[PDB]
Amino acid sequence: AIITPALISALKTSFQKHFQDALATAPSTYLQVATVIPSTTASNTYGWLG
Amino acid sequence: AIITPALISALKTSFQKHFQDALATAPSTYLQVATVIPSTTASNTYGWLG
């Protein structure tokens, strides 16, 4: 006649991490639509002739 | 010739086991819809991070 706190609830229970980091995020797709340009200062300026 | 119909008429037979295992049962399928998580106590508690 063990008291409920020390029962299947807590005393008899094993922790498992099968659900961890299983639901993923949508795959990255920004490369297909955008291109990467590096920078090394506060801003970047672009110019073309015509 | 003449004989009781409970000895010869009963023993003039050849038992065969063709009918055994003639049919089958539906194949296992729960693998395609479930994973197997072994347990070592009364219950298993699961926890994952957000």
Numbering used by the authors:
A (entry chain B), B (entry chain C): 2 to 51
Provide the authors' own sentences about this structure as they appear in the paper.
The virion of bacteriophage JBD30 is composed of an icosahedral capsid, long flexible non-contractile tail, and a baseplate. Using its baseplate, JBD30 attaches to Pseudomonas aeruginosa via the bacterial type IV pilus, whose subsequent retraction brings the phage to the bacterial cell surface.
The major capsid protein can be divided into the N-terminal arm, axial domain, peripheral domain, extended loop, and axial loops. The capsid of JBD30 is formed by pentamers and hexamers of major capsid proteins. The extended loop of the major capsid protein stretches over the peripheral domain of the neighbouring subunit positioned clockwise in the same hexamer or pentamer.
